Symmetry: C3
Amino acid sequence: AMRIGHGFDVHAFGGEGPIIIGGVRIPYEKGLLAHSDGDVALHALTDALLGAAALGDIGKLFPDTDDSRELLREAWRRIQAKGYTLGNVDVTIIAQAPKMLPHIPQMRVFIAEDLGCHMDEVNVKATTTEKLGFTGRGEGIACEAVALLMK
Amino acid sequence: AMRIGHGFDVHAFGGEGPIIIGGVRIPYEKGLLAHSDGDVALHALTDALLGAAALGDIGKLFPDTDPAFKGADSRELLREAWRRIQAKGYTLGNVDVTIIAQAPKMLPHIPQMRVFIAEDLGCHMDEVNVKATTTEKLGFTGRGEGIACEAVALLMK
Amino acid sequence: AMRIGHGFDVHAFGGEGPIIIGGVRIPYEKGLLAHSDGDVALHALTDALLGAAALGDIGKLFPDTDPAFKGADSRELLREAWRRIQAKGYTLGNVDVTIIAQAPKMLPHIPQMRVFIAEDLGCHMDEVNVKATTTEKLGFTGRGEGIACEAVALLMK
Ligand SMILES: [Mg+2]
Ligand SMILES: [Mg+2]
Ligand SMILES: [Mg+2]
Ligand SMILES: [Mg+2]
């Protein structure tokens, strides 16, 4: 038995940079507004994983009301507690700028660390909306993730 | 033999509430403009399921230009799709749904959405996940113009 | 040994049509602005396949800065990605694609898209699904500023 999940997160630019994405500080004119560290890749990743496990989402488990890497780790703990193991993950950063490609190899390493898995089971990509939409206008950054879990 | 599918849908706000999402009537100051009842979550889910089964999409099965679907219950649409998918030899692995909305708050309603989806797919609640996420006031969902939903589905032959 | 991947692309409209989506030339009052042919569907699909294979993305493999890709047939880019993926020991499970557009109408063209993709991947077209979905006049797609597409892919070792 195997399970699929999907996650999506967005944070708005504000304040001064750098931004943290996939656990990597990327220098930029602007920072990202958030309650946590605003790591849109790790949030989206975490929700895909919880979603595959039918454990809900970060919103339910970790209320903004009541850091991302730790949220990921705590989510994974619970998910492994349920008998699941990693199949793979794939992540899609949607952003006009800054350039992500230089920082992506390091993000894989970090995610692999956090999920206790091999780097070849983690992929991360960047894609632009060609100046369209709120990401295109540089109002914020969005990220999507998918995950496959095996029981 | 496993198969994957992805779905995506959007409806604009207009009219008076409530809205219908994941089958649940949620109070809100506005309704959703739609040919059907406007259930973005069930639409996205139906497309993910049809996509995994390579049976096209809801635009093909349930076109808005057809007046027979006016006011349609999206749970009956889901059930109709799922009948075709099961006839084609498939059983459910799992589904994960991601509602994208600034408002109204969805988390209180997610448990009853899971109940309805699990009933409609004849599966256990443990194979249905629904999540809600905001765009932090950005974009059309952030400006409160409409609501989007995505879904992924895994099927087994 | 299954693997999932996800892809997403966008191009902006400009000039006159036709556009090229899923390898098919579709008449439209507007064309797409892109270094390559602008095929958002095949780009998204290619990224999903590369993502399942932990091989990166098309921004890395086929950069707009490289004059070799000026006017590239996006099917060639797909095939070249697929050859790299197959050299890694992956086989196709299935793919599902989601075109996000206000217009033009995609449904008439989807059967040819599926023929093209199936041929390009060496697979049966029962393993390929393509869907279209509107944002109902919302957002950049809704306002007719561009087209988006998403894809998911499942591979096996
Ligand atoms: Mg968020
Ligand atoms: Mg998406
Ligand atoms: Mg729709
Ligand atoms: Mg692109």
